[PDB]
Design an enzyme around this catalytic site. Structure first.
Site, PDB file in Angstrom:
ATOM      1  N   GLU A  64       1.505  -4.921  10.946  1.00  0.00           N
ATOM      2  CA  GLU A  64       1.102  -3.520  10.915  1.00  0.00           C
ATOM      3  C   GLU A  64       2.017  -2.773  11.874  1.00  0.00           C
ATOM      4  O   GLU A  64       1.930  -2.963  13.085  1.00  0.00           O
ATOM      5  CB  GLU A  64      -0.357  -3.377  11.373  1.00  0.00           C
ATOM      6  N   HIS A  78       0.825  -1.198   0.000  1.00  0.00           N
ATOM      7  CA  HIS A  78       0.000   0.000   0.000  1.00  0.00           C
ATOM      8  C   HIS A  78       0.867   1.258   0.000  1.00  0.00           C
ATOM      9  O   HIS A  78       1.728   1.440   0.860  1.00  0.00           O
ATOM     10  CB  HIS A  78      -0.940  -0.017   1.211  1.00  0.00           C
ATOM     11  N   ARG A  99      -3.290   4.817  -2.117  1.00  0.00           N
ATOM     12  CA  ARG A  99      -3.204   3.472  -1.546  1.00  0.00           C
ATOM     13  C   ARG A  99      -3.013   2.405  -2.619  1.00  0.00           C
ATOM     14  O   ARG A  99      -2.170   1.509  -2.485  1.00  0.00           O
ATOM     15  CB  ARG A  99      -4.482   3.172  -0.753  1.00  0.00           C
ATOM     16  N   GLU A 155       1.858   3.707   2.980  1.00  0.00           N
ATOM     17  CA  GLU A 155       2.409   3.128   4.201  1.00  0.00           C
ATOM     18  C   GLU A 155       3.936   3.151   4.182  1.00  0.00           C
ATOM     19  O   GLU A 155       4.591   2.110   4.150  1.00  0.00           O
ATOM     20  CB  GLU A 155       1.875   1.708   4.378  1.00  0.00           C
ATOM     21  N   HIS A 199       2.889  -3.936   6.452  1.00  0.00           N
ATOM     22  CA  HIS A 199       1.982  -2.804   6.274  1.00  0.00           C
ATOM     23  C   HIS A 199       2.127  -1.846   7.466  1.00  0.00           C
ATOM     24  O   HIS A 199       2.857  -2.129   8.416  1.00  0.00           O
ATOM     25  CB  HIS A 199       0.525  -3.287   6.209  1.00  0.00           C
TER      26      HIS A 199
HETATM   27  C1  LIG Z   1      -4.135   1.165   8.850  1.00  0.00           C
HETATM   28  C2  LIG Z   1      -4.036  -0.267   8.303  1.00  0.00           C
HETATM   29  C3  LIG Z   1      -4.742  -1.226   9.269  1.00  0.00           C
HETATM   30  C4  LIG Z   1      -4.602  -0.318   6.857  1.00  0.00           C
HETATM   31  N1  LIG Z   1      -6.002  -0.102   6.837  1.00  0.00           N
HETATM   32  S1  LIG Z   1      -6.734   1.144   6.061  1.00  0.00           S
HETATM   33  O1  LIG Z   1      -5.718   1.912   5.268  1.00  0.00           O
HETATM   34  O2  LIG Z   1      -7.382   2.051   7.064  1.00  0.00           O
HETATM   35  C5  LIG Z   1      -8.003   0.499   4.921  1.00  0.00           C
HETATM   36  C6  LIG Z   1      -8.849  -0.632   5.510  1.00  0.00           C
HETATM   37  C7  LIG Z   1      -9.842  -1.115   4.443  1.00  0.00           C
HETATM   38  C8  LIG Z   1     -10.678  -2.346   4.871  1.00  0.00           C
HETATM   39  C9  LIG Z   1     -11.962  -2.532   4.295  1.00  0.00           C
HETATM   40  C10 LIG Z   1     -12.726  -3.682   4.618  1.00  0.00           C
HETATM   41  C11 LIG Z   1     -12.213  -4.649   5.520  1.00  0.00           C
HETATM   42  C12 LIG Z   1     -10.936  -4.470   6.105  1.00  0.00           C
HETATM   43  C13 LIG Z   1     -10.167  -3.323   5.784  1.00  0.00           C
HETATM   44  N2  LIG Z   1      -9.587  -0.187   6.712  1.00  0.00           N
HETATM   45  C14 LIG Z   1      -9.239  -0.512   7.960  1.00  0.00           C
HETATM   46  O3  LIG Z   1      -8.245  -1.216   8.221  1.00  0.00           O
HETATM   47  O4  LIG Z   1     -10.053  -0.026   8.972  1.00  0.00           O
HETATM   48  C15 LIG Z   1      -9.632  -0.351  10.331  1.00  0.00           C
HETATM   49  C16 LIG Z   1      -8.718   0.468  11.007  1.00  0.00           C
HETATM   50  C17 LIG Z   1      -8.687   1.870  10.758  1.00  0.00           C
HETATM   51  C18 LIG Z   1      -7.757   2.695  11.439  1.00  0.00           C
HETATM   52  C19 LIG Z   1      -6.857   2.121  12.370  1.00  0.00           C
HETATM   53  C20 LIG Z   1      -6.888   0.724  12.620  1.00  0.00           C
HETATM   54  C21 LIG Z   1      -7.816  -0.103  11.940  1.00  0.00           C
HETATM   55  P1  LIG Z   1      -4.135  -1.799   5.850  1.00  0.00           P
HETATM   56  O5  LIG Z   1      -2.718  -2.111   6.089  1.00  0.00           O
HETATM   57  O6  LIG Z   1      -4.562  -1.469   4.469  1.00  0.00           O
HETATM   58  C22 LIG Z   1      -5.158  -3.183   6.474  1.00  0.00           C
HETATM   59  C23 LIG Z   1      -5.126  -4.366   5.471  1.00  0.00           C
HETATM   60  C24 LIG Z   1      -5.906  -4.064   4.174  1.00  0.00           C
HETATM   61  O7  LIG Z   1      -6.927  -3.346   4.261  1.00  0.00           O
HETATM   62  O8  LIG Z   1      -5.465  -4.581   3.128  1.00  0.00           O
HETATM   63  C25 LIG Z   1      -5.710  -5.650   6.095  1.00  0.00           C
HETATM   64  C26 LIG Z   1      -7.034  -5.688   6.634  1.00  0.00           C
HETATM   65  C27 LIG Z   1      -7.568  -6.913   7.102  1.00  0.00           C
HETATM   66  C28 LIG Z   1      -6.788  -8.095   7.038  1.00  0.00           C
HETATM   67  C29 LIG Z   1      -5.473  -8.052   6.508  1.00  0.00           C
HETATM   68  C30 LIG Z   1      -4.633  -9.325   6.423  1.00  0.00           C
HETATM   69  N3  LIG Z   1      -4.672  -9.847   5.048  1.00  0.00           N
HETATM   70  C31 LIG Z   1      -4.939  -6.832   6.041  1.00  0.00           C
HETATM   71 ZN   LIG Z   2      -1.839  -1.771   4.168  1.00  0.00          ZN
END
Ligand SMILES: CC(C)[C@H](NS(=O)(=O)C[C@H](Cc1ccccc1)NC(=O)OCc1ccccc1)P(=O)(O)C[C@H](C(=O)O)c1cccc(CN)c1
Ligand SMILES: [Zn+2]
Length: 304
Positions: A266, A64, A122, A67, A192
């Protein structure tokens, strides 16, 4: 010029992959595993003391684009490996016995865009038929319950799963490489930020992996170890319950390929700075993360 304690643009990271390899040919070889949509070279660094029939661990950064601490970590890891080999007993044993495949930036086109236009981008930068909207979420683009949950079928959305699994050249390139080296790859690590977590399968469904007890124990130990350096607190668990169900993830896909140790990291922080982690935290973040990665590596090696 390149710095391990600043965020580097792609031109600089690319030059670095050539330089660090030239400076450490007895520990690193560089290959390209494909081209991105915009024709950038997807470099892969094979880090380790060369030898036949070696097992391996695969780690990628920069899925992403925004990040940035992810990209920074892969570079930091490579330096630690080359500088400490022969002196620190663990890393010496690691590189003697196995290879780390380090893919420093997967989504290069997106990364460049965060430097030139939009720091919060992203997705990839591929075009989509029938719309002006750009890009596919690479971590929804793998053949793992593809697009069934936590993903969008709309090219204009940040979680667009693509026209099909592996529709993106970058994800196709990564999957192709891992598929071609399944016999050797024993663990898959994908970096990530942010949130300070270690995730393991599954994310595309609430079901648990066959070895979930072991993965939980491994993650718990890895977070404990990480905390020893600076006190940084990580949480851990299956992806689906630890963040939210999200199909098409590379970690779930790798696991279902038979790679039994598959983790998403993360890194810092918890949202104070979020994706815009100051360069002043690069060193400490990378150093503590090293402890968790080395812990996992030591475990995996001891359980071959
Ligand atoms: C800040 C990080 C947690 C990134 N999240 S993000 O940029 O806010 C976008 C992400 C999109 C999404 C949609 C539907 C279901 C799950 C996730 N939203 C998200 O993580 O929201 C939760 C959150 C938001 C802020 C802080 C902590 C957690 P990420 O690295 O991009 C998370 C990753 C992904 O979305 O591809 C991920 C989510 C769930 C499982 C995995 C393991 N394969 C990996
Ligand atoms: Zn990510």
């Amino acid at each position: 010029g390149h710095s391990y304690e600043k965020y580097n643009n792609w031109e600089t990271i690319e030059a670095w992959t050539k330089q660090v390899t030239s400076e450490n040919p007895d520990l690193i070889s560089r290959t390209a595993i494909g081209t991105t949509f915009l024709g950038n070279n997807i470099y892969l660094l094979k880090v380790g003391k060369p030898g036949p029939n070696k097992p391996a661990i695969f780690m990628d950064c920069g899925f992403h684009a925004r990040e940035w601490i992810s990209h920074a970590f892969c570079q930091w890891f490579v330096r630690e490996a080359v500088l400490t080999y022969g002196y620190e007993s663990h890393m010496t044993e690691f590189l003697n016995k196995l290879d780390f495949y380090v893919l420093p930036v997967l989504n290069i086109d997106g990364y460049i865009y965060t430097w030139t236009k939009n720091r919060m981008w992203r997705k990839t930068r591929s075009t989509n038929a029938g719309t002006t909207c750009i890009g596919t979420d690479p971590n929804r683009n793998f053949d793992a319950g593809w697009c069934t949950t936590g993903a969008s079928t709309d090219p204009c959305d940040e979680t667009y799963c693509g026209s099909a699994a592996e529709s993106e050249k970058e994800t196709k390139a990564l999957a192709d490489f891992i598929r071609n080296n399944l016999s050797s790859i024993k663990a898959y690590l994908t970096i990530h930020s942010y949130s300070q977590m270690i995730l393991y399968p599954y994310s595309y469904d609430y079901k648990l992996p066959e070895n979930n007890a072991e993965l939980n124990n491994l993650a718990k130990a890895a977070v404990k170890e990480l905390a020893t350096l600076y006190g940084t607190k990580y949480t851990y668990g299956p992806g689906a319950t630890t963040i939210y169900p999200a199909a098409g993830g590379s970690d779930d896909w790798a696991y279902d390929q038979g790679i039994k140790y598959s983790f998403t990291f993360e890194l810092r922080d918890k949202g104070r700075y979020g994706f815009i982690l100051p360069e002043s935290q690069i060193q400490a973040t990378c150093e503590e993360t090293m402890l968790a990665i080395k812990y996992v590596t030591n475990y995996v090696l001891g359980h071959l």
